[PDB]
Paper text:
Myelin gene regulatory factor (MyRF), a novel membrane transcription factor expressed on the endoplasmic reticulum membrane, functions as a trimer. The trimerization of MyRF is associated with a fragment between the DNA binding domain and transmembrane domain that shares homology with the triple-β-helix and intramolecular chaperone autocleavage (ICA) domain of phage tailspike proteins. MyRF is expressed in oligodendrocytes as a key transcription factor in the formation and maintenance of myelination in the central nervous system 11. The MyRF ICA domain with its upstream β-helical stalk seems to have a similar function for driving MyRF to form a homotrimer and release its N-terminal fragments as a free transcription factor from the ER membrane by self-proteolysis.
Here, we present the crystal structure of the MyRF ICA domain with its upstream β-helical stalk, determined at 2.4Å resolution. To gain insight into the folding process of the homotrimer and the details of the autoproteolytic cleavage reaction of MyRF, a precleavaged protein was generated by expressing a noncleavable mutant of the fragment (MyRFS587A) based on previous reports. Unexpectedly, the protein was split into two fragments at the front of the autocleavage site during crystallization, resulting in the production of DBD crystals and the stalk-ICA domain crystals. The space group was P321 (a = 78.7 Å, b =78.7 Å, c = 138.5 Å, α=90.0º, β=90.0º, and γ=120.0º) and each asymmetric unit contained three monomers, which belonged to three different homotrimers. The overall structure of the trimer showed a drumstick-like outline with the stalk sitting on top of the trimer connecting the DBD and ICA domain. Each ICA monomer displayed an α1-β1-α2-β2-α3-β3-β3a-β3b-β4-α4 fold architecture. The C terminal α helix (α4) of each subunit of the trimer wrapped into left-handed superhelix and created a cylinder that was approximately 27 Å wide and 51 Å long. A “cable” from the neighboring subunit threaded through the middle hole of the “donut”, and the cleavage site was located directly on this “cable”. Additionally, our findings showed that MyRF was cleaved via a highly conserved serine-lysine catalytic dyad mechanism and that cleavage would be activated only if the ICA domains were organized as trimers. In contrast to the viral ICA domain, almost no interaction was found between the MyRF ICA domain and its upstream neighboring β-helix of the stalk; thus, activation of self-cleavage may not be triggered by the upstream region of the ICA domain, contrary to the observations made in phages.
Residue numbers in the entry:
A (entry chain A), B (entry chain A), C (entry chain A): 559 to 705
The structure:
């Protein structure tokens, strides 16, 4: 609908380049606009995080040219095809994407990174419960070792 | 000030829809624009993370219509009213919000998710110190068990 | 190239203020646009996270005025000069920045916070492996204590 450095904007705003924000990024999290509010399983959140594969990579020059970014800057993230098998809520199909040389990539996948970070919050909550359980099992051994 | 798919933009940029970014999101973190720099308490950061409640939810169709998003896509996040009692720095009141049916929601709350993720970084730093303390208490038991 | 509340936009989009997004932020993580895909060392990711320094701070009024943000709102983040020594992939030099009083700050540093959060994901994966190793060493002590 509104594209910066680009034509064919599927989403409300598409930025072919970097975004520099002085303030913060806000999202509507008010309860009064929600429904089907169910509790998450933090144990399942830690499992999906531990299966995820983080990679160092760089963008192909043919893609970086048509996307307004640099191919020489190192990147660190995830593979959308691998995350889709683990957390498909964080992956979307955005149709075709044409590179700078004319190569058309059909069914190009994008990733909602904030969804992964939210999953990481629940993973920390699970780690907090596991370490607290380990400290209890450690405390029984220490009290048993001084008797 | 500048709104996409929307009127009444309270903030510098309001996007009623999704944002697709090819590059990265940058923030001004230079020291020379900061003051009142105080150390954080990672122990307090882990406590606020462990109290937070992650929920699976979906947006009401009346809200999703007036916000340029879909009601059928599953979501995972936080309740702004619940985070405000835990981390009020991450919650802001944005005034009134009118749904697609005319229902006016006064004192609508938004959430800065990056503030929660930053809090999660300090929670990991606290978990790193707790597990290192547990390994020391484990190491004393193992060396005591071989004597 | 496109600036909101600002002149001199170095990047594709610069927002002097806050950004309110109804939907999600998406990034191109498709494998077919990647190269030099190497595995990350989660042990190195936990080390860089544990060295990082989180601070509470507020923006100087002279900077907040020229950036479209408030100086009275509390902030929590990182020092770009300190992160650059730890994770230089997350820091960029954006040239000169002039405050509201005329003070020119040369070599102003910005931070990609999502790069830090991605690093935090690998830190959780390392904590998951350490706690699992501690539970094994605890389990040997418990089975040895009942013989």
């Amino acid at each position: 609908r509104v594209g910066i450095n680009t034509d064919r904007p599927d989403e409300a705003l598409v930025v072919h380049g970097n975004v520099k924000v002085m303030g913060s990024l806000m999202h509507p999290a008010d309860l009064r606009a929600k429904e089907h509010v169910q509790e998450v399983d933090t144990t399942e959140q830690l499992k999906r995080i531990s299966r995820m594969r983080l990679v160092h990579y760089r963008y192909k020059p043919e893609f970086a040219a048509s996307a307004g970014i640099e191919a020489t800057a190192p990147e660190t993230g995830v593979i959308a095809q691998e995350v889709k098998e683990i957390l498909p809520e964080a992956v979307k199909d955005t149709g075709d994407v044409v590179f700078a040389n004319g190569k058309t990539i059909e069914n190009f996948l994008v990733v909602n990174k904030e969804r992964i970070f939210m999953e990481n919050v629940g993973a920390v909550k699970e780690l907090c419960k596991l370490t607290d359980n380990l400290e209890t099992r450690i405390d029984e051994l220490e009290r048993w070792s001084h008797k």
